Every structure is written in C-alpha cells, then in structure tokens.
Design a protein around this ligand. Sequence first.
Ligand SMILES: *[C@@H]1O[C@H](CO)[C@@H](O[C@@H]2O[C@H](CO)[C@@H](O[C@@H]3O[C@H](CO[C@H]4O[C@H](CO[C@H]5O[C@H](CO)[C@@H](O)[C@H](O)[C@@H]5O[C@H]5O[C@H](CO)[C@@H](O)[C@H](O)[C@@H]5O)[C@@H](O)[C@H](O[C@H]5O[C@H](CO)[C@@H](O)[C@H](O)[C@@H]5O)[C@@H]4O)[C@@H](O)[C@H](O[C@H]4O[C@H](CO)[C@@H](O)[C@H](O)[C@@H]4O[C@H]4O[C@H](CO)[C@@H](O)[C@H](O)[C@@H]4O)[C@@H]3O)[C@H](O)[C@H]2NC(C)=O)[C@H](O)[C@H]1NC(C)=O
Ligand SMILES: *[C@@H]1O[C@H](CO)[C@@H](O[C@@H]2O[C@H](CO)[C@@H](O[C@@H]3O[C@H](CO[C@H]4O[C@H](CO[C@H]5O[C@H](CO)[C@@H](O)[C@H](O)[C@@H]5O[C@H]5O[C@H](CO)[C@@H](O)[C@H](O)[C@@H]5O)[C@@H](O)[C@H](O[C@H]5O[C@H](CO)[C@@H](O)[C@H](O)[C@@H]5O)[C@@H]4O)[C@@H](O)[C@H](O[C@H]4O[C@H](CO)[C@@H](O)[C@H](O)[C@@H]4O[C@H]4O[C@H](CO)[C@@H](O)[C@H](O)[C@@H]4O)[C@@H]3O)[C@H](O)[C@H]2NC(C)=O)[C@H](O)[C@H]1NC(C)=O
Lengths: 611, 611, 305
Amino acid sequence: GLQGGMLYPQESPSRECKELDGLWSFRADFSDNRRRGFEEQWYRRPLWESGPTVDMPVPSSFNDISQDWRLRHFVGWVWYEREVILPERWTQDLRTRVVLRIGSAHSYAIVWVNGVDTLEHEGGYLPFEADISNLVQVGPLPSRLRITIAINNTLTPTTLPPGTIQYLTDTSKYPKGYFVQNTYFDFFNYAGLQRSVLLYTTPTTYIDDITVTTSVEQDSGLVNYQISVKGSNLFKLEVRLLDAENKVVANGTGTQGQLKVPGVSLWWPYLMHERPAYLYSLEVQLTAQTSLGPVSDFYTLPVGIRTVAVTKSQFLINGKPFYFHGVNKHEDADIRGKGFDWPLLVKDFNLLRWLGANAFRTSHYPYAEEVMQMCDRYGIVVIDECPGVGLALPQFFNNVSLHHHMQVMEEVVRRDKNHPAVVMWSVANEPASHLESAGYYLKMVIAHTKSLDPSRPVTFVSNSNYAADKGAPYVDVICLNSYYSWYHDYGHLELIQLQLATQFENWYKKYQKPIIQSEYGAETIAGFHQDPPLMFTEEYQKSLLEQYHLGLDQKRRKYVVGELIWNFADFMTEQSPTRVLGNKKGIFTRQRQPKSAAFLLRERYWKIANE
Amino acid sequence: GLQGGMLYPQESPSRECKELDGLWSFRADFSDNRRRGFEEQWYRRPLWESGPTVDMPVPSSFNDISQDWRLRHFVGWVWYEREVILPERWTQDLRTRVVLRIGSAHSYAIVWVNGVDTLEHEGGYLPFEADISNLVQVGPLPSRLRITIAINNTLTPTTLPPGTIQYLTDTSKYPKGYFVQNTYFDFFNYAGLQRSVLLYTTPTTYIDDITVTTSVEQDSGLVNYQISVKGSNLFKLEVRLLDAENKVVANGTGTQGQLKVPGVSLWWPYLMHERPAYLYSLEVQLTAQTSLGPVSDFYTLPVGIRTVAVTKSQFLINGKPFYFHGVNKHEDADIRGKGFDWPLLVKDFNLLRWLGANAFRTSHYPYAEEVMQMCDRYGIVVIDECPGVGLALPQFFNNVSLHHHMQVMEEVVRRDKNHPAVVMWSVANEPASHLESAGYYLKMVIAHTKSLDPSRPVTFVSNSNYAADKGAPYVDVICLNSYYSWYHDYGHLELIQLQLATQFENWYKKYQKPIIQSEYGAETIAGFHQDPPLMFTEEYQKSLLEQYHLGLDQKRRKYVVGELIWNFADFMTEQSPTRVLGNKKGIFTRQRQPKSAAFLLRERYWKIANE
Amino acid sequence: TVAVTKSQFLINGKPFYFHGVNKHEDADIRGKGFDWPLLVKDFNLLRWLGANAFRTSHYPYAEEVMQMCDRYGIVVIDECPGVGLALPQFFNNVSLHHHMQVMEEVVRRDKNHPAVVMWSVANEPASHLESAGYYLKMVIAHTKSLDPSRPVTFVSNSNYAADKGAPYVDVICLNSYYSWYHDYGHLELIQLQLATQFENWYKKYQKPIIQSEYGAETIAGFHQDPPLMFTEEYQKSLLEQYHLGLDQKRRKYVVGELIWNFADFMTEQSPTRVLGNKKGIFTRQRQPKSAAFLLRERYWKIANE
Ligand SMILES: *[C@@H]1O[C@H](CO)[C@@H](O[C@@H]2O[C@H](CO)[C@@H](O[C@@H]3O[C@H](CO[C@H]4O[C@H](CO[C@H]5O[C@H](CO)[C@@H](O)[C@H](O)[C@@H]5O[C@H]5O[C@H](CO)[C@@H](O)[C@H](O)[C@@H]5O)[C@@H](O)[C@H](O[C@H]5O[C@H](CO)[C@@H](O)[C@H](O)[C@@H]5O)[C@@H]4O)[C@@H](O)[C@H](O[C@H]4O[C@H](CO)[C@@H](O)[C@H](O)[C@@H]4O[C@H]4O[C@H](CO)[C@@H](O)[C@H](O)[C@@H]4O)[C@@H]3O)[C@H](O)[C@H]2NC(C)=O)[C@H](O)[C@H]1NC(C)=O
Ligand SMILES: *[C@@H]1O[C@H](CO)[C@@H](O[C@@H]2O[C@H](CO)[C@@H](O[C@@H]3O[C@H](CO[C@H]4O[C@H](CO[C@H]5O[C@H](CO)[C@@H](O)[C@H](O)[C@@H]5O[C@H]5O[C@H](CO)[C@@H](O)[C@H](O)[C@@H]5O)[C@@H](O)[C@H](O[C@H]5O[C@H](CO)[C@@H](O)[C@H](O)[C@@H]5O)[C@@H]4O)[C@@H](O)[C@H](O[C@H]4O[C@H](CO)[C@@H](O)[C@H](O)[C@@H]4O[C@H]4O[C@H](CO)[C@@H](O)[C@H](O)[C@@H]4O)[C@@H]3O)[C@H](O)[C@H]2NC(C)=O)[C@H](O)[C@H]1NC(C)=O
C-alpha cells in the first residue's frame, strides 16, 4: 500500500460540502507551446483577469458541451476555477480537518488552493485529496476559497492509457505547427473534471484508513479488520457490526482484530440467492485525546461477507460454482462525455437486472464510485481494470512504464479493495503479450497485485494467439477476445462455431484454467435489417451472438466460466473509417434503448440464471 | 404579492447544504384507491419498513429511469425519502435559521420533516420552503433529519396544466378499475422531484425578500429597491452596488430607497451591444439586534439595469427597437425527463448563441432557475409562461380555476420578477379564448399580472381566429400560432406565404399592436429526405421554414416584432398517431444534434442580427 | 373444391386456414409500376414468412395471379376496388350500377385462376347505412350470378348491429386496430376487446370469420422498451396480443388472419402518415423488420399443426 490512505467521503459526526456539481470558470490554453498558462502564472490571479473565460459543468468532459471543434480535439493544459464560501466554523475551530478531494482529473492535475500549489496527480481514472485543515487562516478574514486546477493532453509513452505525440514538419501537406496524438485503444480520450469535486472535514485525529478481509467457517462468517488513524497518541478503537438495519451482531476493540458474526448472511450475486447482495455495516468509532481534548470520529463501512476461490476448471463464489453472464460497459453518453450522472447510473442498473447480467467488467479503466452500487442489493460482480489499454508498441513496455503500472495498481486496489462486488482484477486489456518484454512486465505488474491484495485472483484480458501469448502462464483465469466473422472472415457466421470450440480446446489443453469469453460482438446500427444477415445489421448481430452462444454452451459447464458480450452500449471513439460515429458494437444504443439482439441476450441470460 | 417571500439560496455569511442531487428511497402507491400510503401512514416510519422500496435520483422524473410501463404511466401518490446528517452547529446555535427547500414537486406535495407534516404545495412548476430553525431539538440527540415527500397524478379540472380523469366501467372493453387521464396540452406530464432539494440557513432576522425596479434618466440609470426583513425590531439596512467585478459604484441606506448609478452600463441582449448582458451586483447587508446580539446577513442580488416599453407597431428594449428571433424550448431529454442537468444546460446555451437566437419562451411553464443564465453575459431575453396549457374545455374556466391562476401568477412573478432577462409575461398558451367565459377569465388573470408587476407587458399566446378571439383586446403585444401546410392544407407550402400575410393584416388592422410569430414549424424526422419536399422530411421543414420567413420579412420592420420557431428540440409527448415517439417538430434532435433546417435558421438569425 | 361451412372454409374438403398478408402495388420510383424482379422477390418473402394466402388489397393486381396458381399455392381473395365508399353521396344508383359493371370485368378476368378462392366486393365502406346495406345487397347478389364457384364477401370495419351488409356475406372480414386508432398504446386491452368482437359478430351472424386487417405503424430504426408508438418493439407486443387472441378462436370458427401489410407503401399526405403507411412488416425496400421474424415463426408453427 502506497504512503497515504483512501476511504470515500460519507458524512456523519464530521461532514462534507460539495461543488462536485455546478458551473465553473474554464479556459483552454493553446496556440503553440505549453503556453502562457504558466509563463503568466494564471494561477496567481482570477482566471477572468488572465483572458476570455468560459463556463464549465462538473462532472462533465469539456469535449462535447461546446460547438468548437478545436476544444473538442484539444491536447495540452486546461483550466478550471471556483470560489467557495467557507463556513465560519470551517475556519475557526482547529479540531476540524478540511480536505479537498477530486474524483479524478486527467494525465496531470495541478490544484492551487491554500495560497499556492496544494496538489498534483499523474494520470489514472482515480482520486486525490489535499490539505489537513490549513485554510490560510494566516492573514485572510472572509473565508472564500479560490480553487484552480490545470489538466493535461490525451496521452504519452509513460502514462496509462499509453499514447504518442508526433510533429509533422510541413512536408507539402500539414500546416506549420501540426502535430498529432497517436493512441492504441478503442475509445475517445475525454478530459476535464468528470467526477466528484467535494470539500470535506474530519477531526484532526481521524480514522485514516480501514480495510476488511472476509471468509466463511461453518458457523457463519467472520470479518477480519485493519484500521489506521492519523495523529494524537492516545485513543481508543472499538468496532461493531450491525446487520440489514442496525441489529448489532458483533463488536471488536483495537486498531486490529477479528469479528465472527454467527447466524450467517452472505453477500450473494444477483445470480443465486433470492436475497442476494447482503450488506452488513461496520461501525468504526474512535475516541482520541488530542490537544483540545478527546475528540471522536466515526466512519461506518459497508461490509459484505463472501469468498472468491478458483480451480483448474471452475470459478467459485461463496464456495459454489458461478458462471459469469454479464457485459462490458463504459462511462459515456451524449453531451456529458464521461461525466458522472445519477439518472444514467440508475437506468443502466435497471437495464442490467432487466437483461439478467449478474456481472460486468470495468472496461479498460476504473469507474466512478458506483462500485458501491454493485454492492447494494444489486449484487453485480465486478472485474476491476486499470488503464493498461494500448500496450501495443514495444516501447510502451520500458521500465519507467513498469514502475508506473505498479503505482496505478496500488491506487486502483486502494480504492476498490473494500467492495465485496469486485471478485477479480485485470491489469491489462489486449497488450502485446506475445512480445518477450511484455511477458516480464506482466508477471511483474501481476505478481505485484497478488501482493498488496491476496483476496482475489488477478488477470489481464488478451487477443493473443495461444502458444504466442507470453503473459498467459501467469493469469489465474483466462480472458479471451475473439470476433470471428468480424475483423476476419467478413460475414462468415458459418465459421464462428468451428473457430471457437478450438480456441478454447487449445487454450485449456495448454493452460489448465477457467476461460472467460470477455468479449464478442458485431458492429450494429439500428434500423439496418437484411434477411440474409449481412453487415452492420440488427439480424447479423443476432446471428453472430446466437452462434457465439452456441459455442459457449459446449464448454460452459466445463472450463469456460464466463461470458461478457462486448458492449452494453454504443460509445464515442476517435474518428476512423471503421468507426461510425463511435463504436456501434453495443446491444443498447447510446441513449439506452434496446436493439433486437438485446432481447435475445436477455433470454439466454435468464435461461442460464434459471438453470 | 402573496404572504411570504422568495429569493434563490446563494450562500455567503449563512450557507446551504444540498441533497439537490443524490439517490433516494422511492415508491409508487397503487392497486385501487388513494391507497394505503395514508391508511397505513407510511410517513411515520422509514419507507423500507412499509414495503418494497426502490432507488430514485434527484433531479429526475421517475417516468423513464425504470423498465416498468406502469410506473411510466402512473397516476396517484408517489413517495420519496432521504436521511440527512445535520451538522452539530446546525442544531445548537439558535441564531441559525434552517429552511428546507424544494425546487418543484407536482400537482401536490406533502413534506414530512420536523416530526410531522411540515409543508404542502399545489401544482405549479415552482418552489416551496419550510421551517425556520426548529429541527426537533426537543428530544432528539444525533441530528439525522428524515425527509419524506408524497406527490400526485397527471392532472385535474382545477390545477394547471388542466386535466380530466374518467373511469370506464367494463363496457365489454376495458378491465374492472380502468380509468384514464385526459389532457389537452402537447407534452408528456412527467412527475417526481425534477429540481433542487436543498437544506439551507440564515440568521433569525434575515433579508426575507428584496425587489428591484430599474430605468434610465440620461445621465445613466438608477436602481430603485425594496427590502423585507423578518423579525427583531432593531436593525439597519444599507445597500451598495458594485459593477463588473466590485468597483463600488453606489450605496443606499434603508429598507426602501433609490440608487442612481452614473457612468451608465445597461443590460443589452445578445442582439445589439458588443458587451451585452451587463450585470451589476447589489449588496444587501443587514445588521439586527436580535436576542443574542446584533447578527448580520448579506444576500447580493445580480441587478441588470434595462428598460422594456412597447408601442402600437414596435417593441423597445433600452429604448431602441428590438426584434425577437429566438425559439421555444422545453425541459426534456433522454432518461432524466425534465430533471435539472448542468451539462445539458450549458450545451443548450452554446447552441442558442450558435444559432443566433437572442430570445426564448418559457414554453408552457416556468423553468428551473437558469433564468439567471439568461441574465449572464448570455443576454437571452425571456417570455415567462405559467402553466395555462390545455385551457380548451369550457369547464376549465370556472371561478375556482380563475382564483387558482391568480395564485400561480403571483408565485411565477415572485420568483422571476428580478431577472432583467424576462421582458414579457404570458398567462396562457392557446386557450379557448374565443369562448365568452374565457375572455373574462383572461382579462382577470391578465389585469392581475399588470398589478403585482407594472414593469413589463403581459400576454397569452393564441391559435384563435381574429374576430373570434375574445381575450385579444387585452394583450399588450400579439402572439400567434399558425402551422400553414401543417395541420391543414397538408403539403401545401405554395399557400403558406398567402395565408400568412393576411393573418397579420387582419390582426393588426383590428388590434393596433405588435405581433410576434410565437410558433411555426413542421414535424421532421432525421434521415428522411424527398426531393419534392413531402411529409416528415428534412427538406420539407427547410421549405415551410423558408416560406414562413418569406412572410415575416414583409412585415418584420412594421408591426411584427418577433419570431419564435416552434421547437428548439424534439421532446416527449403523450402517445398518439400524430406523435411519433414525441413531438418531432424541433430543429435539433432530442440529443442536441442539428437538422438541415437548423443551419438555415442559423443563417437568417445571424443575417438579421447583422442588419 | 372451395366450400364454406357455418364455421369453416373448406378446400378439397379438408378445412383450411388463411395465414397470410394484405399487400399493395407500390414500389420506389415506379410506384404502381410492375416488374418481375420485385415480383419474384415478393413471392420469395411470401414463401419465406410461411404466408400461404394474401388479399389483393383494394384492387385487382397485375399477373401475380398467374403466379399464385403457378407452382406456389397461395390462396388469394380477389378484391375489386370500391374502397373509399365513405360519403352517402357515393351511394347513388348510377355508381351502384358502375360497381355493378366492374364485378363482371373482374370475374371475367379471374374466373379460371384456381388461386382466387373468393371475391370481395368492397373494403371498409359506410356499411352502417341501410342504403349501403342495399347497394352491397345487389352486388353480393350479382357476383354470385357471375360465379357460383366460390364465396363472396366485403371487408368491414363497423360495429356489430350497425353492419347492414353483414347478413349477405358468407364469411365475415373484420378490420380491428385495438391499441392503434383507439386507446393509444394499450396492449393490455387488445386480448379482450377482440374476444368480445368475435363473441358478438358470431352470436348473431353465425358465419365463419377472417381477421382481414391488423397491426401498428412502425418506423424502422425506432426502438424503445415499454414498447411505445411507431417502435419495432411495440409491433412485436401488439402483433403478439392479437395472435394470443385469434388462437382462442382458431380451431373454433375463425378461419384466417391477415397482418395488414406486407410492406410499407406510399399514402397521400397527412400528419398521421409518415411517408406513406408504415404498418408493413417489410420495408418498402423489401427488408425484414424485427416482427417480420416473429410472424413467420407463427406461420410455420400453425402450418405444422
Ligand atoms: C501538457 O501538454 C503539453 C502539450 O501537449 C505536453 O507537452 C508535449 O509533450 C509531448 C510528449 O512527448 C511532446 O512531444 C514530443 O515532442 C518531441 C519534440 O520536442 C521538441 O520539440 C517541441 C516542438 O518544438 C517546436 O514547436 C514549438 C511549438 O510551436 C516551438 O515553440 C518550437 O520553437 C519548435 O518550433 C517548430 O515547431 C513549429 C512548426 O512545426 C514552429 O514553432 C516552428 O516553425 C518550428 O518548426 C518542443 O516544444 C519541445 O520542448 C521541450 O523540450 C525542450 C528540450 O528538449 C525544451 O527546450 C522545452 O522547454 C520543452 O521542455 C522539444 O524541444 C518529439 O521528439 C517527440 O517524438 C518522439 O517521441 C514520440 C513519443 O512521444 C514518438 O512517437 C516519436 O516517434 C518520437 O520518437 C523519438 O524517440 C524514440 C524513442 O522513443 C527514438 O527512437 C526516435 O529517434 C525519436 O527521436 C514527441 O513528439 C511535445 O513536444 C510537448 N509539447 C510542447 C508544446 O512542449 C506536456 O507534456 C503535458 N504535460 C504533462 C505533465 O503531461
Ligand atoms: C392523488 O391521486 C389520486 C388518484 O388519482 C387522486 O384522486 C382521484 O381524483 C380524481 C380527480 O377527479 C377522481 O376522478 C373523478 O372520479 C369521480 C368518481 O369518483 C368516485 O368514484 C371513485 C372510484 O370509485 C370506484 O373505484 C375505486 C377504486 O377501485 C373503489 O375504491 C370504489 O369502491 C369504486 O369501485 C368501482 O371501481 C372499480 C371498478 O371500476 C371497482 O373498485 C368496483 O368494481 C367498482 O366498479 C372514488 O374513488 C371516489 O372517491 C372519493 O369521493 C367519495 C365521495 O364522493 C369518497 O367516499 C372517497 O373517500 C373519495 O374521497 C368517488 O366516490 C368522477 O365523477 C370524475 O368524473 C367527473 O369529473 C371529470 C373531471 O375530473 C370529468 O371528466 C367526468 O366527465 C366526470 O364529470 C362529472 O362532472 C361534471 C361537471 O364537471 C358533470 O356535469 C357530469 O355530470 C359528471 O358527473 C373523475 O373521474 C378519482 O376518483 C380519484 N381517485 C381515487 C382513487 O380516489 C387525488 O385527487 C390526488 N390528490 C391530489 C391532491 O391531487
């Protein structure tokens, strides 16, 4: 675990304000260099004063909310700013700890709050917190916090997702300063503040970081806890566990211990128990004798008790077989890009249950916070990925890159190691794992996640030829991508069934382990129908899907333990001849309306769920 | 002005919390009667305990976020609930005034907060506030506010929008308890909490209600103010006015006065000044000797100085001619229904400027709060309507209804009488104004708005035959709806030009006043093209639009002072053979993508704006 | 042999059952135009659906009749024009006599085709009139004084007990559009409003029925859960309820069903009409819609019992 701690801001005796939503002053900086953004030090004086500002909502990518194409396709530094009114009690009580938090930035964020640079963060789709209390009480008066944040370009060889810039000196074509951003992943690299931006508070001695690990021992389960405090010297920690509402069912005492909750009541996925995702709540209460007396702090952490093992043929949750029949989603939708949205979150979770998908994959990057949604009665199992996307070029597998991927895997695991929904990790999606250097890098990143977190298996999804895949000897469960009929053998659904059964036989015969069909599908646009299936047509999709399902059924109850149709929905991708206004490969439209294939998938998922 | 006061919660020395966003427990109540919602008194014990609850986001209509058709088309009582954590200072300082506010409910809302029924409100698309401080400090301890709200059906003969229920006792057709909601307006009656839900605080003696009226007197303008306080006895009011940033440019002192700000700097609409919507800020500071000493309160109200007159031929803003070339919008979008959304607000305001529309009409009902958006540099003039929609049946014009419309017009005017953007009121849209009773009712409602607010003209838009329209002698400016080629003379764009010029001549020749083409357009779906224009086709729309513009150009610089193409975008309507998945009459799709007609409109709007 | 009971349509003595469609002579560019490419394509989709029947919607076609007889075996309902008989104006003797003439031309053109199992004198005319009940009286009569080899009928969209022409036909043709046209979007209402409509008509006319028209208008790329309007899904929900209903009367006394159109076709202009009628299960350009698939599972199913 990296030097710090992370728990999600959820008020109780010590609350949270939130500009996590709202309008914001904004500005893009360009014409040539990194530009004046820093050569004029815009940070030391209200953006408006610097030059022509604009409005920006949060959470929301700035890409689509405007009418200007150069902002849509910008690469460089981008600014924000907001003027908060600090409560009086905020700035005059010394027991309160006021922390600024961001749910996510881009490849680089610089926050200028506390009369200066207060925070910086590198890449990731993850959050970062600053300050302890210090709100520049030293010479101020009217508590008005001025926040400024600067953010960066699409990608680089050392970040994740990986990219590559490249200038093109007027070779008869391309203007003077023309440069381009080359990327190797299937999605548009949206930017801007797309998640939570909320100021919050705790006492000075706060429950910095808990952590629970669970299991099952006949007479019920038993939550094992770890806690971390920050400060004082003198304090006391006593934890208690309440069931469905608040029936106190257990109590421990220390900054380390156990909790054997009898009666039992595990966290089952939408799949099996009639009463699935069962959440018990852990109440961490700490009383510390600080400077100005013994202050207290509480947190309460939803604890879901469940076990996740694996064999050479079958995946097992709560010690019983579990077949994955879910989907791969994404954070995308008209206007807002990847910005967080409560209604689109709710619709999407009603559709998942509507379909009968009891699981999904954090498609190429960690998600908002809704991993708690997976926890709630919902019971939607999750395969958590980190941005190891376009790891195709051999250069992207250099040692700094490897050190970086080990950093990001500590953050991703920090943030989601508490969710009973997450049952597996993914360190990468379709890397050049056939390459020799990459197999090393993979064993590295992977063996590293096995440490830090020994509770659930690790893996990386691949489109690599068996026998040609170098990383595969190190994954605990096989994840395969194959688009037979698509990408190759254009229009040949008569081949799918054949080419499939083999890929599985070859994979298991070599690597003795559970395979998951982590990706399959055809690019379909609505309103296109052709009797003989043909191209980007609704029936074709029903045909490939139908045929793929045909191959999964032969080995499903053997060593194939999962199924993830490609996309839940259509999303935006970078502009290419093969991409028609994005990746039209989803069973639901971008506006969550179903396609003919959806109904079909819904039938299978429910049939299986009933077996 | 009705017994109360309303100002928008905007923190300063006395802040605001906000669950205005978030997830919420929810439940619809039905199977027959008003049902058990009250016969079991669900309000006196956590919804979960009552029965099977569900999640609901706010702001968002509950109509579309689910997969169940009976929730989509429900009529009756609907519940919500949330458990807030009250700050300690919240509940232990007696100087703080903690008010619960809702941005809007439906035809009926019942809020159960303060250990009981704390608030109720009838219809409208407007807000309501409760409590003063009383947070049940009397016998509580851990400040956890439990809020409950119940909401009602689609419509009735006395509400606004007007409706009619009707049972149909199994006449061979229709099941046992089958009843239907008959309505007479062109939109889907979405429900649920669709706007702000935010708890806030002030001291006990607070600036309850200000109000400014402005003008121009050669050497600059002069803001005239009114203030209202609530409580104490002893206090002092001194106001000051700062320009573009904070150059103090004026100061007054009292709870009534003037403010003659020299140098001048009026609020111009996107239309004319290169520096348009200029907002000065008014700082209301009040110090009152209460119980526990002289507490203070501040508000700061954006004041935009501008004058709006009218003649028998031309409309005049800032004393110069002003031609309306805007649009009619709506609150609607995939998933969220009519829920508030910051990114969709920003996109929509970029498109308005993109088009060149310097004005819009609050299409059949008051909008969220974004009337401040109209104020901001944007400078987007606004014609504010109240829900006088399906006033078609003669029954809907009964005396209680008339009293009601006078109530709602006090609220609508309370809430928006401060916006320098609003330049006109509309008390109704297409009423049966030919009917005799309705003309009386209209003169009533109208003469009533002229009182309360004598700053800007009043009107109601009509599709009534001149000579047949009874209310028309009472409007200050004529608003006409006509869909020549559409609705009649199906496909005859060769007639538009003819039928138009006449409607105008007949209207002005009788009624000597400025006409505004408040509505025109053709139902167009994207991807449909036909050389000879034809039906629901993009070219046809370019043709009718093109032809309508042809008729407006003849009288535009005479007595026709405005233009409002029908819809900015496509929206959802109740299901009918004439409505294809809603009102497809907009120049932009539901997802804000432009149609071929948009480009055309954009050209005209900009051409005119340049004249 | 083409017989007819009080409860069934007999073909060579073995009880029959129409499970086809209602078509039209409408194509892109060529409109009413005729050609073998579309002609053949159509018969291909026809055998495809399992449609073993089809009515010549509102007029006598071109040489498809040669085709139905031809190596196919698609039992047609030969239909004379006489469809817009809305106004009582259209009820004078002059025109009664005019209609009278065409039934000669039409039988004089199709007498021999084995395909044409039955004549249909008109479609959705103002049958609720006593004068119309007499106009239709004369022609139903005359038609059988021209061809006593097969039944006669006229497509009705009136309520039972107001149909003046109902007492003369030999098989009733009912045009219901529940959920559509009325009680907009109410799928849950269909199954019943339809039972009742087959309960009634029979309790009085005692003849065998044919659901000659049904469906919903649909724009191809449209999709929506909670079915909704001109949506592919809605059609799947409507069609389904109609099928769940007819199934109750099948084997009983209903002897056929005819999903409105085979494909979309142009119409005159109206805010109710998108770019002609859209109620078709194949696009104007002959491609399937989702339901085109749901109908054919019905057809082969039925044809297999
Ligand atoms: C926030 O956003 C920032 C903006 O995106 C971002 O900065 C950018 O980072 C990327 C990341 O790599 C940089 O991209 C690389 O650029 C290298 C070239 O760098 C040098 O040249 C730059 C451009 O300079 C010209 O243009 C400027 C803009 O007008 C002018 O100011 C200059 O005067 C100069 O003028 C020319 O350009 C115009 C016309 O084209 C016009 O001005 C004039 O007529 C003239 O033609 C410089 O800006 C840059 O400056 C930095 O470094 C120098 C010292 O090194 C300092 O003096 C500066 O202060 C500054 O620190 C450089 O001088 C490319 O080499 C590089 O390509 C190689 O690597 C990529 C992978 O990224 C490969 O795909 C590619 O094939 C190349 O491969 C090379 O390496 C391989 C091994 O991997 C090797 O085998 C092979 O041989 C090969 O050499 C890539 O394009 C980009 O330059 C930065 N932009 C800017 C504006 O600085 C910043 O990082 C972001 N912040 C964060 C934290 O993310
Ligand atoms: C929150 O949501 C609530 C739910 O929507 C909402 O309440 C509803 O308000 C509407 C508003 O009008 C009401 O609609 C009117 O209903 C009148 C009939 O009312 C009476 O009958 C109701 C139904 O009762 C049957 O059904 C119940 C449900 O199953 C059973 O419990 C009953 O036992 C009864 O059974 C029958 O129904 C079933 C089968 O159909 C089945 O149960 C059984 O087999 C049997 O067949 C009663 O609920 C209602 O009760 C109220 O009033 C009585 C006393 O009067 C009390 O005892 C009750 O406690 C309760 O307070 C009534 O008994 C209609 O008359 C009315 O139609 C007329 O008006 C409309 C305009 O609205 C016209 O369009 C229409 O043409 C009619 O016109 C009439 O007036 C004109 C003048 O304008 C006149 O010229 C003409 O002659 C004509 O008479 C309309 O349909 C609806 O009933 C309420 N629903 C419920 C469930 O109560 C509530 O208001 C919302 N809250 C707020 C604040 O908005």
